């Protein structure tokens, strides 16, 4: 069946996919730390992280069968078990957000056993059911080798080099832009190397240039006789005074000079001069506009132009809105990707190990980054229900009320009418 294979480089276990030496696991870890230093890159990959940490997660039954009691009770188990972990769900996401800087984030799952105080990894609930605790965790600088599997097809296993070699099904791995099915995927920093390298060096040339701009520096020209140790005390005293003049001259009120002046009859030129050093040219390239071009290019690579341009009146970060921003949709792709890793990973492991073995599974979802524009929503419904179309439903009356920030109304207590005039 599998007549082919995903042979990327297969050099020595280490993935030699990227032809650039600097951007490979032994050194790519070195480079990404460097690239994170620039504010333009740092802010670009920090706005994305903020969005993920902002959304919430809730376990729900599948697309259909939301009415089933057995499924609905399973969600209550999972939602409670999500917060049971010793590190909050949000904290796990923060550890996951190492995603952007490296392109992948391993997380060795650790399963607490029979719920019940007990010990090992203590936990609330005592329904003697399996659960999660501790790592996740993990860092990208520890993983040395990725173990293969015969023909290199479907080999998701790696060590953590003392060494703590882990098997394939023990951890979750998140792929940013998995293209050839390589474990490391592709960090978003990969397609921003060229602007960054150009931007940093030209910035560095500018700073050095300002420091070495000696135009206007005071220059004192003395005859060689003055400069020395065997010179007469009067001459040596003169040189000492010039040293203080150089070291202490400012542009205060009493600024001025009384210098000796002697135009030599020979050569028709003066011997002593106090002059300000002058340059007879201008710098070729305008460094100011040069850096600005690269900064926009870096933000273009991460599609984070909102950082520079700012929030517009026709762009929005709301996923459900009809005018989602380019950057806002990018986090959606990232958000969906985590949901896809959920397929084989923890929930399936939790489900299968605990037995049950049901065809339908329980899936995790995400909410919107920001609430959609109510005014468009408000104009929509109010002006389209009086004509027909919309059929009023509990779902409609709940989503609309939840947009404000409320919860589905209890019909048990209504609003009074005696006051309503």
């Amino acid at each position: 069946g599998e007549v082919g294979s995903l042979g990327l480089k297969v050099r020595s276990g280490r993935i030699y996919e990227e032809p650039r030496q600097a951007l490979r696991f032994p050194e790519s870890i070195k480079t990404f730390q460097l690239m994170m230093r620039d504010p333009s890159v740092a802010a670009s990959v920090n706005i994305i992280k903020m969005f993920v940490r902002k959304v919430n997660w809730r376990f729900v039954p599948p697309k259909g069968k939301e009415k089933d009691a057995k499924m609905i009770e399973r969600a209550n188990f999972f939602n409670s078990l999500m917060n049971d972990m010793e590190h909050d769900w949000a904290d796990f996401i923060n550890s996951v957000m190492s995603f952007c800087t490296y392109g992948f984030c391993v997380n060795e799952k650790v399963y607490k056993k029979r719920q019940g105080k007990k010990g090992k990894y203590p936990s609330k609930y005592n329904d003697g059911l399996i659960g999660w605790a501790k790592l996740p965790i993990r860092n990208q600088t520890t993983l040395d080798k990725w173990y293969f599997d015969s023909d290199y097809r479907k080999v998701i296993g790696v060590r953590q080099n003392l060494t703590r070699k882990l098997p394939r099904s023990k951890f979750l791995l998140f792929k940013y832009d998995d293209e050839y099915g390589n474990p490391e995927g592709r960090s978003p920093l990969l397609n921003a190397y060229v602007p960054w390298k150009y931007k940093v060096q030209i910035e560095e040339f500018e700073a050095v240039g300002v420091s070495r701009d000696l135009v206007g520096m005071p220059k004192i020209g003395l005859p060689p006789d003055y400069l020395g140790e065997d010179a007469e005390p009067e001459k040596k005293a003169f040189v000492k005074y010039c040293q203080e003049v150089v070291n202490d001259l400012i542009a205060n009120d009493r600024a001025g000079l009384i210098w000796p002046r002697f135009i030599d009859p020979e050569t028709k030129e003066d011997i002593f001069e106090f002059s300000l050093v002058s340059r007879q040219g201008a710098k070729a390239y305008d460094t100011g506009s040069i850096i600005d071009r690269y900064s926009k290019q870096i933000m273009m690579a991460f599609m984070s132009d909102v950082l520079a341009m700012g929030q517009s009146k026709y762009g929005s970060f709301s996923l459900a809105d009809s005018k989602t921003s380019l950057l806002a949709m990018s986090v959606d792709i990232l958000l969906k990707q985590i949901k896809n890793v959920i397929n084989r990973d923890l929930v399936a492991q939790t489900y299968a190990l605990n037995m049950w073995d049901d065809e339908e599974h329980v899936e995790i979802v995400y909410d919107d980054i920001e609430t959609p524009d109510i005014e468009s929503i408000g104009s929509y419904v109010q002006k389209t229900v009086a004509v027909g179309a919309m059929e009023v439903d509990k779902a409609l009356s709940d989503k609309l009320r939840e947009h404000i920030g409320l919860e589905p109304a209890d019909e048990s207590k209504p609003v009074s009418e005696n006051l309503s005039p």
Partner: protein
Amino acid sequence: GGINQCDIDMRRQNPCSVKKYTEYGDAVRYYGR
């Protein structure tokens, strides 16, 4: 000037100098100065 990566290191050890805010080849090295 500074060409020989060598002379620069020897001149980088002399205690009697000035701590420059930034010099060439600074932002590509982790262990900054």
